[PDB]
């Protein structure tokens, strides 16, 4: 009674990831902040339209066909903050990394 | 100030003062300049006129 | 005009963008350098 | 729920309505008053 | 075949007429013990060597 | 660096600042769905709003393991951008 | 060109003011309401 | 250029509050060069 449940897991973080995603470029498109409350509440409407679903295996179909919409209509530029992976401000400046050494009298006639 | 749990500091005497300064410089120089030569543009009359 | 009218005072755009096939790809098109870095680096510099 | 939601997020944005956050179009133009008011003067003087 | 086959996620016990579901679901949950949990699902094993035509 | 009573008066003030979360029992300590009952929907809400307000950007995989204060808390106090 | 010069350097200075005010922000949908917080380089970016 | 005008300085803030917090002007030798670039936008063009 453990495959089920991991089985069913990994579909709820899945789910969890995509409204994430879904969110986030909800944002994205709404750029003024008072515009993103009425998608916002739309697209959890949405969500939560489709939830209690019994049968795994339309649950993990409802999945795809919601990551395949995702992928089609994500922004094409989404927000990064600058330090994130993929910023404006990425490896800018980073800090040195540890355990480098810098060797003195390396080419020597003799030792 | 502050209003809920945030307080914003007042921006610099100077940079309030040069902002608005040039500013209004810029819109002086428009407001004039419209005055002096506004026929010439518009087609009223010609620069010897 | 156009300027304060689409920025300040709309709330169909970003539908129109998510529901609309030709509307989201417009977009994308003027976005992304009217696509013209992705086509030109892809092919030429690709074949390279 | 999508009302939870946007009750949320709008209870988390209460500190965007600051008053120096507010309204921004009063500072559009910040050179007007004076330029106008020495404008008029200008106008009085030449006569 | 049984070990690997008759798994519980594809296992649907039907009841049709006098007949009370949560009488049913008791004696299930009481008497459908110990059987396969496998990780293979139909579908994969249908994805895995389709039928074309 | 931020400290870390800030940081738990920042993430329990974004958890207060929720319909479905009586404000009354709120702890450092407590579970998002066991304590104060919400379900994973409204956990990534919290997450993202956690994010937007100290400005940072969590990868999914730690958005869906920050589940509950403590683990919110210890995130943002480990994480050097706070 | 000359005038180009003159005001696009203008700008590019202002708004690198901006960004470095800003922990280096550089993306406009997040940089609202800076009208009053940047007195003098919000009239320099409003004369360029 | 009315849009980057709207959204950098005049739309209602959109920010994070961490930014708004630490923002600070162009200090005197980033506005030196602003305030001639100024001068130069406003009055080159009427000179030359």
Known sequence: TAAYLARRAAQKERVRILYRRALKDTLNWAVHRHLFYNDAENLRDRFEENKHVEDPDTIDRLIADAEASYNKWRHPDPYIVPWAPGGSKFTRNPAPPQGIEIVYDYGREDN | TTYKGVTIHQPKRWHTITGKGLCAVMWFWVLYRAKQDGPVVLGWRHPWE | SVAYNVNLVADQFQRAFQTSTFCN???????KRWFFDQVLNDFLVRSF | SGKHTAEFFRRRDAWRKHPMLTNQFRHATPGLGIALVAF???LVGEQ | ????????????????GAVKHEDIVEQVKKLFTKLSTDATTTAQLVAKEPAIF | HLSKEEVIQRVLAVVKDFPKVDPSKVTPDVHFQKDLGLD??????????LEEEFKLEIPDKEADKIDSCNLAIEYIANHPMA | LMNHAFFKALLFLSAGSVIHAMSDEQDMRKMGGLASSFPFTYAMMLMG | ?????????????????RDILRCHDAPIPMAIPLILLALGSLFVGYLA
């Open chain 8, 1 to 17: 250029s009315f849009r980057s005008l709207f959204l950098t300085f005049l739309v209602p803030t959109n920010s994070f509050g």
């Open chain 4, 40 to 42: 008029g003067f200008y």
């Open chain 3, 25 to 31: 790809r417009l977009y994308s098109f003027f976005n």
């Open chain 6, 40 to 49: 994973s929907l409204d956990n990534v809400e919290i997450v993202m709003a």
């Open chain 5, 1 to 16: 075949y049984i070990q690997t086959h008759y798994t519980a996620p594809r296992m649907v016990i039907a009841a049709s």
